[PDB]
């Protein structure tokens, strides 16, 4: 397989606000799999945030961001979108969109590809 | 601050573990290197600007 991920969005924001991220995929993969976002805090480990199937049927979210982050999909651009609000100080980190190339998701341990880091910073 | 004092640390053992444990150092903001890996990575010189 040969898949390229283009990430867009990020910057400096105020606490409790909303910002913009979106990831597009190109190339060719084995199958139409899941797509998710991964968070890396500075000095910490890389942990997943959520995971959405390609057909927007079932959604999976982490317990730490449930009810605060959401992810949807385009209908004419093949680009995944995500929205967030009520951002807090811990959200300042580097985000990466990742493609999981299997039909049914079991766990977030095996990750196929990674995108360029998008650093988001929130403060007063 | 304008006449910041410069100190150099080299040809010795760099003990960041002592620095990492004092309560008064409330502000500890590090970039480029993780705070927990300071003693692992070896650098030729350390420059302290006080």
Swiss-Prot record, chain B:
Domain of life: Viruses
Subunit structure: Binds to host ACE2. RBD also interacts with the N-linked glycan on 'Asn-90' of ACE2. Cleavage of S generates a polybasic C-terminal sequence on S1 that binds to host Neuropilin-1 (NRP1) and Neuropilin-2 (NRP2) receptors. Interacts with host integrin alpha-5/beta-1 (ITGA5:ITGB1) and with ACE2 in complex with integrin alpha-5/beta-1 (ITGA5:ITGB1). May interact via cytoplasmic c-terminus with M protein. May interact (via N-terminus) with host bilirubin and biliverdin, thereby preventing antibody binding to the SARS-CoV-2 spike NTD via an allosteric mechanism.
Function: Attaches the virion to the cell membrane by interacting with host receptor, initiating the infection. The major receptor is host ACE2. When S2/S2' has been cleaved, binding to the receptor triggers direct fusion at the cell membrane. When S2/S2' has not been cleaved, binding to the receptor results in internalization of the virus by endocytosis using host TFRC and GRM2 and leading to fusion of the virion membrane with the host endosomal membrane. Alternatively, may use NRP1/NRP2 and integrin as entry receptors.
Name of this chain's protein: Spike protein S1
Species whose genome carries this gene: Severe acute respiratory syndrome coronavirus 2 (2019-nCoV)
Included range, full protein: 350 to 399 of 1273
């Amino acid at each position: 397989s040969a898949v390229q991920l283009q990430a867009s969005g990020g910057g400096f924001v105020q606490p409790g606000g909303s910002l913009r991220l979106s990831c597009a995929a190109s190339g060719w993969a084995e199958t139409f799999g899941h797509m998710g976002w991964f968070r890396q805090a500075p000095g910490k480990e890389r942990e997943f945030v959520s995971a959405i199937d390609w057909w927007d049927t079932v959604h999976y979210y982490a317990d730490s961001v449930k009810g605060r982050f959401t992810i949807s999909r385009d209908n004419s651009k093949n680009t995944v979108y995500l929205q967030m609000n009520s951002l807090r100080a811990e959200d300042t980190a580097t985000y990466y969109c990742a493609y999981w190339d299997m039909d049914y998701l079991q766990n977030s341990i095996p990750v196929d590809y990674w995108g360029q880091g998008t650093q988001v910073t929130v403060s007063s | 601050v304008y006449a910041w004092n410069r100190k150099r640390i080299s040809n010795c053992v760099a003990d960041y573990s002592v620095l990492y444990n004092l309560a008064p150092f409330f502000t500890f903001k590090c970039y480029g290197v993780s705070p927990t890996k300071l003693n692992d990575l070896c650098f030729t010189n350390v420059y302290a600007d006080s």
